Amino acid sequence: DVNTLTRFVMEEGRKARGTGELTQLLNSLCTAVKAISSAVRKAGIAHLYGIAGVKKLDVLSNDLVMNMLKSSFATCVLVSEEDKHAIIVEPEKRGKYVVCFDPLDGSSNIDCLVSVGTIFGIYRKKSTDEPSEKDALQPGRNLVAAGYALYGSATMLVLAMDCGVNCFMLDPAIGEFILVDKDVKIKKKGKIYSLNEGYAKDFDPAVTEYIQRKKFPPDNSAPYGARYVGSMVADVHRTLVYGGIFLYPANKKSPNGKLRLLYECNPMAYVMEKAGGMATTGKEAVLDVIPTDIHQRAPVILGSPDDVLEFLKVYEKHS
Amino acid sequence: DVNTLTRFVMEEGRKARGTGELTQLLNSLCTAVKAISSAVRKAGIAHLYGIAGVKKLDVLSNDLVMNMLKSSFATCVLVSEEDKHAIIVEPEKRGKYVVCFDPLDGSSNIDCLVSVGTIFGIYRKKSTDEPSEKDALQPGRNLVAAGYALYGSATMLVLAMDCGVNCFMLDPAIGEFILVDKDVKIKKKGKIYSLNEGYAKDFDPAVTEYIQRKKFPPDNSAPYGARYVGSMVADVHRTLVYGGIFLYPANKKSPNGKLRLLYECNPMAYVMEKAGGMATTGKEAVLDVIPTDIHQRAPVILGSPDDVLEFLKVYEKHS
Amino acid sequence: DVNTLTRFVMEEGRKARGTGELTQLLNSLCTAVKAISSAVRKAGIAHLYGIAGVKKLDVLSNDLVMNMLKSSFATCVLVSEEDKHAIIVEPEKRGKYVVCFDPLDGSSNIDCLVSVGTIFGIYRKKSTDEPSEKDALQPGRNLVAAGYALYGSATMLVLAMDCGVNCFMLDPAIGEFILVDKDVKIKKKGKIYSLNEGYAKDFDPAVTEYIQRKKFPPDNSAPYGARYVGSMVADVHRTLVYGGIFLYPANKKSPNGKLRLLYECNPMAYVMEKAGGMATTGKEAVLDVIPTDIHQRAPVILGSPDDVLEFLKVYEKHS
Amino acid sequence: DVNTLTRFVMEEGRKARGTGELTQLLNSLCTAVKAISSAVRKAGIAHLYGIAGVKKLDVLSNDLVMNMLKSSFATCVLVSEEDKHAIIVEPEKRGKYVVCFDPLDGSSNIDCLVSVGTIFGIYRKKSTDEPSEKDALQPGRNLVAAGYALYGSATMLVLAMDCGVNCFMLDPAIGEFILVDKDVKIKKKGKIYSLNEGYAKDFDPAVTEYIQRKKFPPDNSAPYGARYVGSMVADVHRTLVYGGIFLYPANKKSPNGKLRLLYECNPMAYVMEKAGGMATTGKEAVLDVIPTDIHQRAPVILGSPDDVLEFLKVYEKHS
Numbered sequence A, B, C, D: 001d002v003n004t005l006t007r008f009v010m011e012e013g014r015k016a017r018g019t020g021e022l023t024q025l026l027n028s029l030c031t032a033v034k035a036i037s038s039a040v041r042k043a044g045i046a047h048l049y050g051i052a053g054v055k056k057l058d059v060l061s062n063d064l065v066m067n068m069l070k071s072s073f074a075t076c077v078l079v080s081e082e083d084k085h086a087i088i089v090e091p092e093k094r095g096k097y098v099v100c101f102d103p104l105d106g107s108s109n110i111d112c113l114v115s116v117g118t119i120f121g122i123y124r125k126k127s128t129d130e131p132s133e134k135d136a137l138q139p140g141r142n143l144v145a146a147g148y149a150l151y152g153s154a155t156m157l158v159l160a161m162d163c164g165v166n167c168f169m170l171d172p173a174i175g176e177f178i179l180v181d182k183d184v185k186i187k188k189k190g191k192i193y194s195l196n197e198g199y200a201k202d203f204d205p206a207v208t209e210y211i212q213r214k215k216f217p218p219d220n221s222a223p224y225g226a227r228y229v230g231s232m233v234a235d236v237h238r239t240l241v242y243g244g245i246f247l248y249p250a251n252k253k254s255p256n257g258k259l260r261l262l263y264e265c266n267p268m269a270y271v272m273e274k275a276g277g278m279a280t281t282g283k284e285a286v287l288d289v290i291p292t293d294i295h296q297r298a299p300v301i302l303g304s305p306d307d308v309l310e311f312l313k314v315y316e317k318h319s
């Protein structure tokens, strides 16, 4: 029988004997995702082109998530890609939770109408101190909930908590996220590798050899296919649904990768581990990295466990 | 001054001194595209999941186009990816046009929600009385119009005719395509290359060398960036919008290429040429291939003229 | 065969051998109506209530019809209830048609969410001097097309021409008006009467007597049911679809009624007659009044011919 | 700050320190209302008219409320205009609440696109017996919550509880009910009376005299205006919003009134009293009537307190 995100999250809160504060936070996030979706699909674009005779989506998306998270009364510290410093919620609206998000991921793909998305990770504040930026410098092991919305051919919200990974399709006729994939697990091994090979000149030798194994298998088998949308949400989601591997490794220029630990790599690493996949920087599990800067980058290699393991094997040889 | 697709096409038809039959065909196709977009964005999916207590998308898309074109009274021969032979329109609903289309391109990977699209090409028939599939076996240079709808982060219709290429954004709030880019032209030279490098082991020596020049430039310029969504409409539309080059060349599993000439390669070659770009098979312009089978494949290299020229210099070396 | 409003107007124009100007006018009206429908249904209301941390509907509606008609290149004079003088279209955008319209009928009614609508009538300019207000002072008999959009439980457009009356339902999933009632004809006699009985103290004695025959039928048949939405478009649409009588009659406090001749009475009077109905002031056919003010009022009694004739019999008796 | 129905209801639930069962109940109802709204506005009607080559709205709406309420796990007994006997939820899905509802109200107005609605009343099961139709025969006084959805020019949900009455506007761009009117109170005295005067021949003398005081005021102030949409939800909501009085008194076809006590009269009476208005049968307060039949009928007079009292004075004089 049918299940909605609103009802699924409410029942989970009841099972967990929560006070309803994280439930209100998720409710507010789901609302914001729906309004971002509506804007990404360009509803109302006709009023921008004179049909009756204004703000970039990056900014609007951030404002939507910021205001909805603030007005939830569930959050104290908010970290966003769009903000230099962490936002400390005024004390009247303060709750226990720390949220790191990317309100619109995939900026290079906005103008060509390729898939984009929203990423989020949720922490419970651990300090006794006044809430500050330091409450967001937790390792991803500490995540309480994380996931993303994909604004692709359809809009899907993927939500991961300790109970597992669940996928919800947004039905736009009724503005309702519908549970369509329950307790999702990733394939043990896939057949697609995903990275920007235009950086090949700057590749670490382990990355160079790994990719070469994908195109010219030593085990006679057939070569992997290649995909790279250029939007982390789209590429990571395909990895979940299809299996395979995704890599934004440290290249000569970016010696710590490009993607941001708090609101891109950690949320995706958490979805992956909860789905029976893996997420490594090469040196360690992504969720084991202890950050020191809220905007700090990390290298990320993630996906099916047989694939990540094969990469790590190559990486160990080279180190 | 605001303009819609319905009004734009109608005025261009008045300037053309058309009898209205092609305009009626194009209205019908755009209605179909709006209904494909709705299904693709998963409107009503809550009913499939039991909200009140099943046709595949590409089958439903085909039915939408087939029915809207037949009932336009403008067509006589219809070629689709999903039908073995050409559909001859029943006599009472016959007009003069031939339409070759892919109703849902990239549809095999719809399961991961990556962008998807509809591609179409329109010809005037050559036959005089009974139409046949011979009316579809024309070279792309005979196209009267061609285009595509992209179901991406937003839905956009790109329409090309002799007058040039125009882009329309679907405003879902009112179901109108809004003219947002008129008389579009690709940039002379781009910075993105797009192909499935997973087939590298099977590349012709010309493709191997060209891709090598993009990753390790001879003149030590910046290497190109790589993008491969895996859906032709998405990869081609980005090529139109951002410039660069898109390749689906011959490999082992596909020695004449994989993409279909009539309703994948030819309509995109036409869009590209009308925007000042190029589309080649390597040996000849795509639009000059004379087809002998409605489902025949063709290699395709397309995009910015400087990039396609640079590929063709490498190709002529290996003749 | 499925038919859309666009395709139906377009084929009607080709059958009438029109040059495309009227078709372009109606296309523009269609687009404006879908945009009004969207604002009436409160799309985007969440932004006015600060979800991301402003025209009134009658004003927005007027701007939409005004802008879409001007940019149609099909009109020279535009009369609106929201503007004191006729609007003269700038010479570069001038067509040959005169449009009188009420952009959002049902004022008493917006705040309580009851049905509202748009009424329009279209004349061809008869004079050969430069477009002026006098070009709109034509009797309804000269109408080339008229009709209305109803924003009710669903949105529907009713379009009347010489060919007859047709009804189109707006499907909001795809933003297409769908032909659902062709060549509509009104019942010869209804069972509903529609007027504001709160004015009973001021009624013309004929209206008093006529309403008494509907509550106390002298043949001892069933009394009529009463319905008075208070929104002309809703009450007259129901009159059209169910049969019956709608009255906004002259009393002595308002010897010309309340409703406006040019953009309320004449359009519904024309829709009625083309459906086999009637529409009278009590003294003459509404469509036969020669207006002298673009805002002059007219009494109306309209609906099923048996009912209207029943009323005129009572009216003649009081003379 | 912006507030949604999902967030308001959850916050009121946390305050009352509920277990979340009632909150799940209202969530499911909210989702059903949205899906009914989408069907009422004829989303997807194009597919019913053959765009690609079914129930009455009554049945579908019932199936939507019925299935959503069952799957909430919050209910044990369900009573609906569309079902002869009370439905007893299977024990695995049983909660403690009893819900009586009209899933689509205003049946005579469906076909002419006039406003229609949904009405609901929520009781807690008092008896500790096996759940039965008996558990629904409580007087309105015992109502935990009630309200209605109006599918008018826009869709609005009106929800009443001990805490008061609140109004939520459906934003269809995002499928979210947005709090727009808080703690609503009706005017002390209105200027509109609402009833079907078609039954004038059957009215009792109290009703006849009250209506005569509204058309011919003894104090010689201005007569009230008349409005009768013919859908109870629409007329009752205009009564809440503008003030005045709504009447469905006994007539010859309906000697105990037409409107039904459990799922029409009691919810609207409850909303009225929580807003500072009144609702009587003429003999008692609606909320005081102890029902013996789940489909039993009652006459009803409701609106601004002064108007209901002025009618009651007339009713008292006629004794």
Ligand SMILES: Nc1ncnc2c1ncn2[C@@H]1O[C@H](COP(=O)(O)O)[C@@H](O)[C@H]1O
Residues within 6 Å of the ligand: A009, A010, A011, A012, A013, A014, A016, A017, A018, A019, A020, A021, A022, A023, A026, A096, A124, A144, A161
């Ligand atoms: N909707 C929920 N779904 C899953 N787990 C929840 C939920 N709500 C609360 N929890 C768990 O219970 C803890 C306390 O909840 P709270 O009282 O809302 O802060 C959370 O940090 C989660 O570990």
Ligand SMILES: Nc1ncnc2c1ncn2[C@@H]1O[C@H](COP(=O)(O)O)[C@@H](O)[C@H]1O
Residues within 6 Å of the ligand: B009, B010, B011, B012, B013, B014, B016, B017, B018, B019, B020, B021, B022, B023, B096, B124, B144, B161
């Ligand atoms: N809307 C239109 N826009 C641009 N060219 C058109 C249009 N309609 C017709 N034409 C041109 O006129 C030819 C004949 O039109 P038709 O009479 O409708 O078949 C077409 O094949 C086009 O070359």
Ligand SMILES: Nc1ncnc2c1ncn2[C@@H]1O[C@H](COP(=O)(O)O)[C@@H](O)[C@H]1O
Residues within 6 Å of the ligand: C009, C010, C011, C012, C013, C014, C016, C017, C018, C019, C020, C021, C022, C023, C124, C144, C161
């Ligand atoms: N779509 C149409 N439907 C019905 N009649 C039309 C249509 N278009 C034009 N006509 C008729 O033809 C006349 C001239 O059309 P036009 O050349 O567009 O101004 C109009 O005034 C109408 O009488």
Ligand SMILES: Nc1ncnc2c1ncn2[C@@H]1O[C@H](COP(=O)(O)O)[C@@H](O)[C@H]1O
Residues within 6 Å of the ligand: D008, D009, D010, D011, D012, D013, D014, D016, D017, D018, D019, D020, D021, D022, D023, D124, D144, D161
């Ligand atoms: N969202 C809510 N809003 C207002 N009151 C509520 C709410 N939820 C529960 N209550 C009150 O608390 C009682 C018990 O709640 P529950 O355990 O959900 O059945 C209800 O019957 C109401 O009186």
Ligand SMILES: O=P(O)(O)OC[C@H]1O[C@](O)(COP(=O)(O)O)[C@@H](O)[C@@H]1O
Residues within 6 Å of the ligand: A081, A102, A104, A105, A106, A107, A108, A196, A230, A231, A232, A233, A248, A258, B225
């Ligand atoms: O062009 P590149 O260097 O391959 O970068 C693509 C990656 O950058 C990103 O776009 C970074 O996110 P932003 O768009 O927010 O800057 C990722 O989504 C994506 O994986």
Ligand SMILES: O=P(O)(O)OC[C@H]1O[C@](O)(COP(=O)(O)O)[C@@H](O)[C@@H]1O
Residues within 6 Å of the ligand: A225, B081, B102, B104, B105, B106, B107, B108, B196, B230, B231, B232, B233, B248, B258
């Ligand atoms: O997986 P590959 O071998 O790279 O092929 C991808 C190409 O095939 C296609 O998916 C063909 O489209 P369809 O299969 O949907 O007809 C193109 O969209 C795409 O360019």
Ligand SMILES: O=P(O)(O)OC[C@H]1O[C@](O)(COP(=O)(O)O)[C@@H](O)[C@@H]1O
Residues within 6 Å of the ligand: C081, C102, C104, C105, C106, C107, C108, C196, C230, C231, C232, C233, D225
């Ligand atoms: O309240 P009244 O006097 O009975 O008048 C109602 C009539 O006035 C109108 O509201 C006039 O239209 P406007 O709202 O544009 O003034 C009609 O819709 C309606 O039939």
Ligand SMILES: O=P(O)(O)OC[C@H]1O[C@](O)(COP(=O)(O)O)[C@@H](O)[C@@H]1O
Residues within 6 Å of the ligand: C225, D081, D102, D104, D105, D106, D107, D108, D196, D230, D231, D232, D233, D248, D258
């Ligand atoms: O035609 P009448 O007798 O005035 O009936 C009107 C009343 O009947 C109803 O339609 C009865 O409700 P249903 O339409 O669900 O049967 C009420 O909505 C309305 O107030």
Ligand SMILES: [Mg+2]
Residues within 6 Å of the ligand: A081, A102, A103, A104, A105, A106, A107
């Ligand atoms: Mg970003």
Ligand SMILES: [Mg+2]
Residues within 6 Å of the ligand: A081, A102, A104, A105, A106, A107, A264
């Ligand atoms: Mg990002």
Ligand SMILES: [Mg+2]
Residues within 6 Å of the ligand: B081, B102, B104, B105, B106, B264
């Ligand atoms: Mg294809």
Ligand SMILES: [Mg+2]
Residues within 6 Å of the ligand: B081, B102, B103, B104, B105, B106, B107
């Ligand atoms: Mg295809």
Ligand SMILES: [Mg+2]
Residues within 6 Å of the ligand: C058, C081, C102, C103, C104, C105, C106, C107
């Ligand atoms: Mg008005």
Ligand SMILES: [Mg+2]
Residues within 6 Å of the ligand: C081, C102, C104, C105, C106, C264
């Ligand atoms: Mg008006």
Ligand SMILES: [Mg+2]
Residues within 6 Å of the ligand: D102, D104, D105, D106, D107, D232, D264
């Ligand atoms: Mg009812």
Ligand SMILES: [Mg+2]
Residues within 6 Å of the ligand: D081, D102, D103, D104, D105, D106, D107
């Ligand atoms: Mg009913």
